[PDB]
Design a protein around this motif. Structure first.
Motif, PDB file in Angstrom:
ATOM      1  N   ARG A  29      -1.740  -7.461  -0.766  1.00 45.54           N
ATOM      2  CA  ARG A  29      -0.870  -8.877  -0.320  1.00 45.54           C
ATOM      3  C   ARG A  29       0.167  -8.161  -0.702  1.00 45.54           C
ATOM      4  O   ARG A  29       0.859  -7.729  -2.325  1.00 45.54           O
ATOM      5  CB  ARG A  29      -1.406  -9.753  -1.188  1.00 45.54           C
ATOM      6  N   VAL A  30       0.771  -7.953  -0.167  1.00 46.69           N
ATOM      7  CA  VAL A  30       2.356  -8.211  -0.136  1.00 46.69           C
ATOM      8  C   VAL A  30       3.316  -9.059  -0.046  1.00 46.69           C
ATOM      9  O   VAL A  30       3.010  -9.245   1.828  1.00 46.69           O
ATOM     10  CB  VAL A  30       2.735  -6.940   0.582  1.00 46.69           C
TER      11      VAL A  30
ATOM     12  N   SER B 214       0.550 -11.402   8.532  1.00 52.22           N
ATOM     13  CA  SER B 214       0.402  -9.261   7.697  1.00 52.22           C
ATOM     14  C   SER B 214      -0.837  -8.378   8.429  1.00 52.22           C
ATOM     15  O   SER B 214       0.111  -7.026   8.203  1.00 52.22           O
ATOM     16  CB  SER B 214       1.282  -9.052   6.663  1.00 52.22           C
TER      17      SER B 214
ATOM     18  N   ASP C  41       6.604 -10.029  13.129  1.00 50.46           N
ATOM     19  CA  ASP C  41       5.981 -10.777  12.045  1.00 50.46           C
ATOM     20  C   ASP C  41       7.566 -11.674  11.011  1.00 50.46           C
ATOM     21  O   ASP C  41       8.231 -10.692  10.559  1.00 50.46           O
ATOM     22  CB  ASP C  41       5.008 -10.629  10.947  1.00 50.46           C
TER      23      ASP C  41
ATOM     24  N   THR D  58       5.974 -10.737   2.331  1.00 50.30           N
ATOM     25  CA  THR D  58       6.965  -9.897   3.898  1.00 50.30           C
ATOM     26  C   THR D  58       8.135 -10.747   3.411  1.00 50.30           C
ATOM     27  O   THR D  58       8.519 -11.351   3.450  1.00 50.30           O
ATOM     28  CB  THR D  58       6.400 -10.480   5.011  1.00 50.30           C
TER      29      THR D  58
HETATM   30 MG    MG Z   1       3.416 -12.511   5.060  1.00 46.53          MG
END
Ligand code: MG
Ligand code: GDP
Lengths: 372, 57, 339
Positions: free
Chosen positions: A179-180, A46, A201, A182
């Motif tokens: 930081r996520v 990501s 992604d 997805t």
């Molecule tokens: Mg990700």
């Protein structure tokens, strides 16, 4: 009733409208270089897409977007401080506070974890800052390879004063570190030198069977991202499997997938900044986790960057050759692997690396259409 | 973990109390259905080209 | 010890069901149908070839009128065809181009489709002002949408890779009923004729019979060796056929609660991609990875014909309600009508 015949001719020109529209849609699809990103969790997929949007895209940054990006960063700051402290007693041997009078701060951070709607009050930022400057808390952070900690912990903890403010506008380096997890799909479309790209992604958690891998049997290329600095850490699901070993297992399954027998793979050996930082320290040596690295000899076709320590050159090429050992075990020349050393949070590193993959991606695309 | 083991136990109990018939009749009803409807199955008994919508000119 | 104590009682109940199924297994379907005259050489021809899609086709669904069908391709398009005249009625652009399934309402008023975006998009085919675009998106699944079929214009069942199925109220967007029994990704579902039950195949090599109203898993059937990719009901509603990666098709009956017959050839190794019965249920048509279809005899377990016109993986097929024709979708970007 020759409106019977009229509606037959009306059916034909509505069809004619679609055929000419589809012909325009045919050339927008044939000029698009579809690129799929794969790799283990927290490897940098990501982040790579965020770099493409920073370099080539002008999207939307309304009020809901700023409040979503700020809240995500504050979530990362909270998890970072609450994970380091909550692990101090659970490490073997445990880590104590340098100053025991900070105990009322440790007691506060633990009572506010797992709360549904955290208001993020002023006292939180003060406790987390006064705890992060504790030498004992720093000692527990240096052992963060013994538990699960996000990579952006130190980056966000060093700037609590910046994030706590009411008018804080996150820089784009802050968004690259954020930081996520997805969910679903995370795509982007952009054009560089009249050649359009399409990166996507696939979100979600750790999937072992990969039934959806059939949907990408015709992509132009696969960009496989590797957290090569994670040689001393475990994955999150079982807390027992090596992150670098699972990346090798995942790469072997992608390289030998029957639906990807002709798709070439551009390998991103990500996190070169942390690998240098971790090797130069000497606390965690690669041979302790991969004993075959002791026997390993630096190749002579190796190209070290200026000022690079020989210790770092051998380490990063070992991780490189552990993946080439898989890619050269099969393939029949039906597809190839092209390794690269990348730093996903280094925007200038991604631009120069992406410009070197142009001519490779362009004729991968040309062979799929039988033009080469 | 523990709660998943209990739901499976009662789920297996539900599928065990099911009343079943013998295959000899189940296969007979299945077979007696095809013969009774084979005459109106176009793919099995081809209809003339005067009836097929994908053949008429 | 209660955890392990429940584990071995689970083994007992599985052994109890195994003996109960063998108790009523007084004969084979092959023995009863060993004397029936064969169907003979069944040769279908390609009557229509639909050429509109720009990439691989993943799903299609005949309309109720046996004339209009909608197809789904990964070119970001969702085309609706007039099978009689080969004319395209609509070419719907999609938000996400990674389509996996597409449905056509029994009333013909809406269509649905979905894929890796984990949402089921409804498209009103009767918009009052503009083009045919999205009217509803059904979100909530944490996995890729593999199959979905309408019950009414306000209800639709879905299946996804999160190992669960759901029944939707389209307008409110709420889940009227969930279905939570599978271990692997649910790949396909089939609605019973009476719309009171439905079967679902998943990657745990098992099919389940669900009660639509309560959400119960009444019955589970096993026997397959790999993931189940396709499923379809027998015309009378008391049996269903399955397709799987182990290159086999099975036939289970609900009243007998076991497998009746296996369709396979030692010359067939590639998995199954789609299944569908003929109108009378005598024929079982299945699409494979080896570019061709096989018309099986549902009663005798011997192949009767082959639909061989495609140049890539046959991804989907279906038979009309009047049983007049069969459509096939393949990765070669074409749809061919057969009879
Ligand atoms: Mg990700
Ligand atoms: N220091 C550093 N951190 C990185 C790099 N690449 C990724 N990260 C961090 O890794 C975290 C998660 O990466 P992510 O894009 O979510 O990987 P994904 O889970 O595969 O999608 C982010 O918070 C980044 O800060 C890198 O090259 N250097």
């Amino acid at each position: 009733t020759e409106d019977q015949r009229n509606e037959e001719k009306a059916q034909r020109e509505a069809n004619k409208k679609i055929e000419k529209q589809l012909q325009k849609d045919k050339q927008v699809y044939r000029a698009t270089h579809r690129l799929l990103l794969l790799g283990a969790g927290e490897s940098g997929k990501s982040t790579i897409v965020k770099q493409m949007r920073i370099l080539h895209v002008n999207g939307f940054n309304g009020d809901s977007e700023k409040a979503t990006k700020v809240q995500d960063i504050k979530n990362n700051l909270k998890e970072a401080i609450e994970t380091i402290v909550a692990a101090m007693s659970n490490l073997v041997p445990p880590v104590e506070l340098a100053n025991p009078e900070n105990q009322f701060r440790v007691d506060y951070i633990l009572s506010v974890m797992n709360v549904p709607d955290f208001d993020f009050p002023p006292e939180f930022y003060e406790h987390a800052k006064a705890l992060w400057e504790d030498e004992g808390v720093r000692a527990c952070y240096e052992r963060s390879n013994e538990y699960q900690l996000i990579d952006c912990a130190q980056y966000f903890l060093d700037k609590i004063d910046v994030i706590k403010q009411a008018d804080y506008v996150p820089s784009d380096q802050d968004l690259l570190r954020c930081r996520v997890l997805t969910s679903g799909i995370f795509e982007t479309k952009f054009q560089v030198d009249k050649v359009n790209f399409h990166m996507f992604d696939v979100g979600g958690q750790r999937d072992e069977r990969r039934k959806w891998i059939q949907c990408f049997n015709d992509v132009t290329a696969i960009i496989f991202v590797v957290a090569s600095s994670s040689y001393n850490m475990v994955i999150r699901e079982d807390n027992q499997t090596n992150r670098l070993q699972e990346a090798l297992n995942l790469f072997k399954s992608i390289w030998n997938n029957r639906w990807l027998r002709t798709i070439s793979v551009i390998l991103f050996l990500n996190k070169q900044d942390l690998l240098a930082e971790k090797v130069l320290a000497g606390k965690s040596k690669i041979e302790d986790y991969f004993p075959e690295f002791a026997r390993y000899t630096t190749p002579e076709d190796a190209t070290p960057e200026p000022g690079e320590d020989p210790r770092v050159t051998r380490a990063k090429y070992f991780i490189r050759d552990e993946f080439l050992r898989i890619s050269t075990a099969s393939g029949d020349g039906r597809h190839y692997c092209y390794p690269h050393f990348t730093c996903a949070v280094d925007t200038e590193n991604i631009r120069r690396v992406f410009n070197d993959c142009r001519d490779i991606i362009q004729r991968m695309h040309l062979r799929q259409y039988e033009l080469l | 973990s523990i709660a998943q083991a209990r739901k499976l136990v009662e789920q297996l109990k539900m599928e065990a109390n099911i009343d079943r018939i013998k295959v000899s009749k189940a296969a007979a009803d299945l077979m007696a259905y095809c013969e009774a409807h084979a005459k109106e199955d176009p793919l099995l008994t081809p209809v003339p080209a005067s009836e097929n919508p994908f053949r008429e000119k | 010890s209660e955890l392990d104590q429940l584990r071995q009682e689970a083994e007992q109940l599985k052994n109890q069901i195994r003996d109960a199924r063998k108790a009523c297994a007084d004969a084979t379907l092959s023995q009863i149908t060993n004397n029936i005259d064969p169907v003979g050489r069944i040769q279908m021809r390609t009557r229509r070839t639909l050429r509109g899609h720009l990439a691989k086709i993943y799903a299609m669904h005949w309309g109720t009128d046996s004339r209009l069908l909608v197809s789904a391709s990964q070119d970001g398009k969702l085309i609706i065809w007039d099978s009689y005249t080969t004319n395209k009625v609509h070419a719907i652009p999609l938000r996400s181009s990674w389509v996996m399934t597409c449905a056509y309402a029994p009333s013909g008023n809406y269509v649905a489709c979905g894929g890796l975006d984990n949402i089921c998009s409804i498209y009103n085919l009767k918009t009052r002002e503009g083009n045919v675009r999205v009217s509803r998106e059904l979100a909530g699944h944490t996995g890729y949408l593999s199959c979905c079929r309408f019950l009414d214009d306000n209800q639709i069942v879905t299946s996804s890779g999160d190992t669960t199925c759901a029944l939707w109220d389209i307008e409110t967007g709420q889940q009227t009923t969930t279905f939570t029994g599978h271990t692997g990704d649910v790949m396909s579902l089939s609605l019973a004729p009476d719309t009171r039950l439905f079967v679902s195949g998943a990657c745990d090599a098992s099919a389940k019979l669900w009660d639509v109203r309560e959400g119960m898993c009444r019955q589970t059937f096993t026997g397959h060796e790999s993931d189940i990719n396709a499923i379809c009901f027998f015309p009378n509603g008391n049996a269903f056929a399955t397709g799987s990666d182990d290159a086999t098709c099975r036939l289970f009956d609900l009243r007998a609660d076991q497998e009746l017959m296996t369709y396979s050839h030692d010359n067939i190794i590639c998995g199954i991609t789609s299944v569908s019965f003929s109108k009378s249920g005598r024929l079982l048509l299945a699409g494979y990875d080896d570019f061709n279809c096989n018309v099986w005899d549902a009663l005798k377990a011997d192949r009767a014909g082959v639909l061989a016109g495609h140049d890539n993986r046959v991804s989907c097929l279906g038979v009309t309600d009047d049983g007049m024709a069969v459509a096939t979708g393949s990765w070669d970007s074409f749809l061919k009508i057969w009879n």
